Paper text:
Cryo-EM analysis revealed that S17R4 formed a major polymorph, termed S17R4C, representing 72% of usable particles, and a minor polymorph, termed S17R4N, representing 28% of usable particles. S17R4C and S17R4N were determined to resolutions of 2.2 Å and 2.4 Å, respectively. Contrary to S17R4C, the core of the S17R4N polymorph was composed of residues S4-Q38 from the N-terminal region of the prion domain (PrD-N) and the S17R mutation is solvent-exposed in the ordered fibril core. In addition, a disconnected density belonging to residues N108-A115 forms an interface with Q30-Q38. Interestingly, unlike Sc4, Sc37, and S17R4C fibrils, S17R4N has a right-handed twist. Furthermore, S17R4N is notable because of the highly “kinked” conformation of residues N8-Y16, which is reminiscent of low-complexity, aromatic-rich, kinked segments (LARKS) associated with reversible amyloids. S4-N9 have a significant elevation change, forming a spiral-like conformation that crosses almost two layers of the fibril. For S17R4N, significant elevation changes occur in the N-terminal residues S4-N9 and again in N26-Y32, leading to many inter-layer interactions. Interestingly, in S17R4N, although the main fibril core is far away from the chaperone-binding site, residues N108-A115, which are adjacent to the chaperone-binding site, form an ordered b-sheet alongside the fibril core. The ordering of residues adjacent to the chaperone-binding site, along with S17R4N’s low abundance, help explain why the S17R4 fibril preparation (containing S17R4N and S17R4C polymorphs at a ~1:3 ratio) acts as a very weak prion despite S17R4N’s lower stability.
Yeast prions have provided an experimental system for obtaining a better mechanistic understanding of the prion strain phenomenon. It has been shown that the yeast [PSI+] prion state is caused by the formation of amyloid fibrils of the translation termination factor Sup35. Sup35 contains an N-terminal highly aggregation-prone prion domain (N or PrD) and a polar amino acid-rich region (M) (M124-D253). Interestingly, Sup35 can form distinct fibril structures, or polymorphs, that underlie distinct [PSI+] prion strains. To understand the atomic basis of the prion strain phenomenon, we determined cryo-EM structures of Sup35NM Sc4, Sc37, S17R4, and S17R37 fibrils, revealing markedly different fibril core structures with distinct amino acid packing.
Author numbering:
A (entry chain E), B (entry chain C), C (entry chain A), D (entry chain B), E (entry chain D): 4 to 38, 108 to 115
The structure:
């Protein structure tokens, strides 16, 4: 929840990578481009 | 939760890499570009 | 949780690398560009 | 948790490398650029 | 947890390298640039 006051640029460029608890299987691709953009996964 | 007051640039550029607890399998690609951007995984 | 008061630039550029507890398998790529950006993994 | 008061630049540029406890396998690439950026892994 | 009071520049530029306990295998690249940046691993 956003319950704060006075904060400028709060977590402005924060990035959180993979979080897994338990017995989980993840295969996939997540990409965000905010603007020539090459984001490429070629397994 | 955001329950704070007076904080400027709180965790502005924070990055958290992989967090796994248990028996988890992750294969994947996560990329964010905020702006020529080459982000490339060529396994 | 963010329960603090008066902190400027709290963890502004903090980076946390891989954290694994248990029996976990991770193969992947995580990249964030905040701005010519070349971030490249060519295994 | 952030439960502190009066701290300026708390852990402003802190970096935590790999932490593994148990039987874990990690292969991957984590890079953050906050600004010509060349971050390259060419195994 | 951050449960402190009065600390300025607490661990401002602290760096923690690899920590492994048990039977773990890590191959990878972690780089953070906060600003021409060349960070290069060419095994």
């Amino acid at each position: 929840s956003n319950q704060g006051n006075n904060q400028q640029n709060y977590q402005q460029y924060r990035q959180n990578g993979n979080q897994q608890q338990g017995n989980n299987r993840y295969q996939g691709y997540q990409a965000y481009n905010a603007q020539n953009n090459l984001q490429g996964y070629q397994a």
